[PDB]
């Protein structure tokens, strides 16, 4: 017996939608939901979505509050809709998927993922919810996450991290590393071997290996010496070159993190969404070196070193395809005289 | 068990709020309420009020659908709020009263008119609803309407017309003429002797007396001759003078109705509300004669003739006070040599 | 001493801005201005302009309430701005000019038209306002209207009609026919010989000549016979042809007026503005004949007959230029075997 | 002589409303007030309230800029309206009270608190303003704050801190500790003995006692040993338990402050208002331990220790009522074998 | 061939408008521009301007991405419009100028600065763009910036810093120090000798001289002793006095930076725009000392010392005019017994 006043009651009393009975007085003014708390209006939600304010309010209240795969993973795996949940995209302040299944009467295309409208869509199934592994077995298309083994299904160990209420973390009290499964046209698909992005921030960047500790602590020329990275253009690619008007390289998040402690810079996130590779309009405050489209990827430094060291440096230019987060990322490799000139996530 | 989805269900299925159980999917976009009817959005209500869209939607759905006193009457009688109903003001497209009693959780100041918050307010009571005559008897301040007699209380016969769903009419299938009662500070008032405005339209003006039939049918100088109105400036006051740049007189609706069949004109309702006297910015299309503030009152022609013929014509200018719709209307009487120059509802 | 509350006071009490002192409480919600009248909000103005709501409110309140030249005339004469007034465009529900001179602090580019910012702009001067004839004499660029003669300047007799509060009319109580003057770069221009559009409505179309009375009263083939219009394609041009899917001709308002009494039709005003020639997407309800762009002009039938009869009918197609409302109107003349096929205001 | 343009002049020149004469050009676009500063619009205020934009602008400009009681105190004391001032709620970006007295023509219910409409409302009086102690003596309901003694009135020493322009602080240059007085139905009410919340932030938490310094500096088991807190479940209640999926305890702000220096966490303020007890949807970033409704109170650690040590630990479960900020806060005390299991601010 | 979908394509692919061909699907909802990225809407721009959302989107995309003069400089130099570029004001989130020249069809007043509409306007010319020095030579009014010498034109060395994408910086990889030129009425104007503001932040304030290092490191009385500033009221002016309810002095940014490390305070930027002198409503959190209008200027401490030491201290009060950023800043100098009492940027 769904209602705006019941959704608001659940938000106010339970912190989110919890199936409780009750109603609070609500007022809707433009794109904001308010509730009366002893005579005055208190803001409950500001709609930042392209959906009607009361509809977005309901989807946000009904968001999955368990650790869930990051939106970039779900997108790279071709997920269209989730089964009986809402994956809230905290990067966009909006639902990650346009439609719902058994969540909200306004956005629902079906009450159950077994209805024929869902057959051509890649439905997201959560093995931690009763009956969802079975629902995935009947689904023509879908992506399944489990905490353990599913008899007969060959698993794909996903990233260590998951999003819990907008917080990307590697769980200690909760499990965040799932097994992944995919189905395309009724056939289970073998998920490729892949690297995973680390999902770290610039403000709170922490090294996750000895190489990463040595990169952040050592000087440029001695880190390169220690790790035998001569001829691999890490000075340009990872460290970044701030000597010319156009900023050179700076494509690994760890190199942006190292620069960040010395001097600050602006990263304009002109397409604010979750993705494996992020494009930024970067302006370095110290030097004034800038770049309109600077592709940045957060790979573990060891993974990036393994990728670049596994390439043939005999051709002037070529497209190098690397599977990261289940998606094929094209990198442009530019070589001269048997050494790397530049290696960057290719701008389409 | 109030909710936006239940109110919308009632609107869609019952034409208005009828206490039925059920919910329809609703979407709110800016100031409009929509409902999904087979995949597409159908508009249910556009908010023209200063209240939040969902709150105004609820008050409109919960409007009184029985013939009720016109807002101008309720306002002239000093009504602040209604007991367990919403008097919808169709002239303003808004609730006639700011707050409610037992109607809507957002606007309610009390669930019952007996709660002390209502004591200082003039509560509107409807004798056609069970218990409201007794609630009025116990209330400190209030206005009561009944279809018949009330033991002990001396009645005041109200206007013949009432508003039914925005349509002002003299009922044939329904009673529209009520008895009026008013209590201030616990004391049953003796309501004054009063004329009533006729609440007619310009497009569908109908005469309600032989004098009114003769006014609309006869030529100016012969109507005045028949009714001995020489020296009362009806040529200026009622007929209107369109010979100069500023339109002369034209203060009685019947005279606007007579002009309307011959030639059209614009009446700019710059304060769109229900009131005993209406101010219009009038532009005559035929002649181009115009007036920024032309006060217009709809009195029965016989009543207006009785008012003007009961005045002393010996002073240049004076304020004439007439009780119309229970309120004191000031008129400006302008005389010269024992004859009327003009007589108009005072602009104050 | 300008203010939102003072402008609202003037609207409420004087019908428009009248320089009176006082303030009323105002509330602004989105694009609507409201005022509190005894506890409740009453709508004073809905902004339909691209200007801020309070700024448009002020310009509308400060509109010229005397008969003024129609916007199409002012536009055809190249008027940019008005001197110390606001010409309200009732067709667009907006000010006719972007900026003001001595009207509103937000839109003013100058307090007086003598300030150098006004020198390159064609300032509209009203000879009925003291000093404006002299201001025009000293202005580099301007358009002047007078009711009578101006010493030295040779007049151009304007159209008989003017707009008074949005009502286009030929004044009887007020003068609406002005003398026109125009100065470009300091030189008093000789305005061209011109026809004038009649500015009539379809709902209340009135004939302004014996030919126009005969057109509306007589049958097609006998009006053409009486006025010797054989070979001039009036059957197609003025009467209109509703026999095919694309509606033929119907370019003179009088012919639309004649059809309107027999059967109704939709005129979609897809560019709602005042102009000499109007484009309509017309759908005939009776036959279903329609046309996406049907140019319609309101010329006096005698003027249109004089124009078409003064053309050479020897070429297949040519552009015929006619001065209407001071502007050059291109028409397309299409002939075959020495007779007109069609003649329509050119779609360019 | 109140106006939008005068309020804006005061904001621009005086930083707030200061009763000065003058006007600046203002433009209102949706919910934002702008002023023209040399050709361009500069934003003066963005409306985050449920009031009309120009009305909220005026109330914000007319906000009390002297140290005033925090909104939670005023709410706990039952304050409805303030006398001749606006208490701006910086937590909600809105006026703390719906209506005003002698502040703004749109929100005013009276010009003076002596008018009968104010009698049933708890009016806030400021003894630092001339005549307000007298006004409180005549008020049927009210809350009075003074800097010193009022003859005959028994005082209540309030919290040390007050809000000055949104900044909660313990004054050094200004007095922030007031005497409190309350009247209910014409009778002065004895304010209960109470603890006061400390109103500290997580980002800038500072200890206000030796116990608080020892809590932040010492290790868990040695702080408990020093202060003889064995059996009082401080490990769960104050320190917090991050070992399970549902976060255990963590109900004192000081314990959140201690965790904050080690590792970060998200506190979703789903009811953003000022209150004695705050509810947060907490997600710990390090462990992934989370809780939908985690009640957090900022008591001085010594005060919290005194409360928990003054309870009988012989019953399985009971409601413990503690007066904090003048309000009775219910705490749920859970005991087993003569020791505390948990003690939390009870979720209604 | 300008379009909303092409501007959005350029934003998405090039980080800004780069003249590329292509279109992306766009959706406009209220004041926000969105683009569809694999089924979902991703926000591209939120309009904070008084221009229509699609028009502001285009101007922002077409912003100058090279280091440009800070808006305060352009304003102080009387710049009205820029030639064939948009100077984005990052302080206001809006275009610095109302109209454009050859940028956007909606805001353009001309396609080239040579058109007569531009003659009376001060056009901003960028010597780094081909043909703009010539355009400045033909311009009746204008401001020119160059990186080097212009034959015959006497230069004015501008500030060391420029804004690059909102980041004020002293360029190392790019040139930020320009030569300035101005023309008024066809005549080149000699730009006065001027000091320049340093454009530093409170959060990241860095000293730019030994005196500034000594000010931040030394104690008050010993800095004054070292620099012989006895009798110059630096204790009040630069250090600030927090002992009374009204905060004393604190008019140099460096003194606010020194206080900021010890204790925090609120600076309410009630006129959020870029200007030489900034007015703040300051509330000191530690003491509670506050000031409604506290003028703050960021001069190099040596420059401020040179200004105050170059004044005659013999008069009680006088206006001291100092050229800063090309504008004449009035300072109020107050002296007693041959010593400074106070010296502040004069509030008009
Ligand atoms: C408004 C008004 N003023 C006057 C009239 N009407 C008519 C008679 C005159 N003495 C003066
Ligand atoms: C638009 C238009 N095109 C034509 C006509 N009208 C009529 C005569 C034909 N020759 C061609």
From Swiss-Prot, chains A, B, C, D, E:
Cofactor(s) required for function per UniProt: Mn(2+)
Documented effect of changing residue 251 to A: Complete loss of NSP15 endonuclease activity
Residue ranges constituting the NendoU domain according to the UniProt record: 206-345
Binding residues annotated for uracil, in chain numbering: 291-295, 342-346
Compartment list: Host cytoplasm, Host perinuclear region
UniProt site positions, description: Uracil recognition site: 295
Active site per the UniProt annotation: 236, 251, 291
Assembly behavior: Homohexamer.
Protein name as it appears in the record: Uridylate-specific endoribonuclease nsp15
Organism: Severe acute respiratory syndrome coronavirus 2 (2019-nCoV)
Annotated gene: rep
Section covered of the full-length record: 6453 to 6798 of 7096
């Amino acid at each position: 017996a769904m209602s705006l006043e019941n959704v608001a009651f659940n938000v106010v009393n339970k912190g989110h939608f919890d199936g409780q009975q009750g109603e609070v007085p609500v007022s809707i003014i433009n794109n904001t939901v308010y509730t009366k708390v002893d005579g005055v209006d208190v803001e409950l939600f500001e709609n930042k979505t392209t959906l009607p304010v009361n509809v977005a309010f309901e989807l946000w209240a009904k968001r999955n509050i368990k650790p869930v795969p990051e939106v970039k993973i779900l997108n790279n795996l071709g997920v269209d809709i989730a089964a009986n949940t809402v994956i809230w995209d905290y990067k966009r302040d909006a639902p990650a998927h346009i439609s719902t299944i058994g969540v909200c009467s306004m956005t629902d295309i079906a009450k159950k993922p077994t209805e024929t409208i869902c057959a051509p869509l890649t439905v997201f199934f959560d093995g931690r919810v009763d009956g969802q592994v079975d629902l995935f077995r009947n689904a023509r298309n879908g992506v399944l996450i489990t905490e353990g083994s599913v008899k007969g299904l060959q698993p794909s160990v996903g990233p260590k991290q998951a999003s819990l209420n907008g917080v990307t973390l590697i769980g200690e009290a909760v499990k965040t590393q799932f097994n992944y499964y995919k189905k395309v046209d009724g056939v289970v698909q073998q998920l490729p071997e892949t690297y995973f992005t680390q999902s770290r921030n610039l403000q709170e960047f922490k090294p996750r290996s000895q190489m990463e500790i040595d990169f952040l602590e050592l000087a440029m020329d001695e880190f390169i010496e220690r790790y035998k990275l001569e001829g691999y253009a890490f000075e340009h690619i990872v460290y970044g070159d701030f000597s010319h008007s156009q900023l050179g390289g700076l494509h690994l998040l760890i190199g942006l993190a190292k620069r960040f402690k010395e001097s600050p810079f602006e990263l304009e996130d002109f397409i604010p969404m979750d993705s494996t590779v992020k494009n930024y309009f970067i302006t370095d405050a110290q030097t004034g070196s800038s770049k309109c489209v600077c592709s940045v990827i957060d790979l573990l430094l060891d993974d990036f070193v393994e990728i670049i060291k596994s390439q043939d440096l005999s051709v002037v230019s070529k497209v190098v395809k690397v599977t990261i987060d289940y998606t094929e990322i094209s990198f442009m490799l530019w070589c001269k005289d048997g050494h790397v000139e530049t290696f960057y996530p290719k701008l389409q």
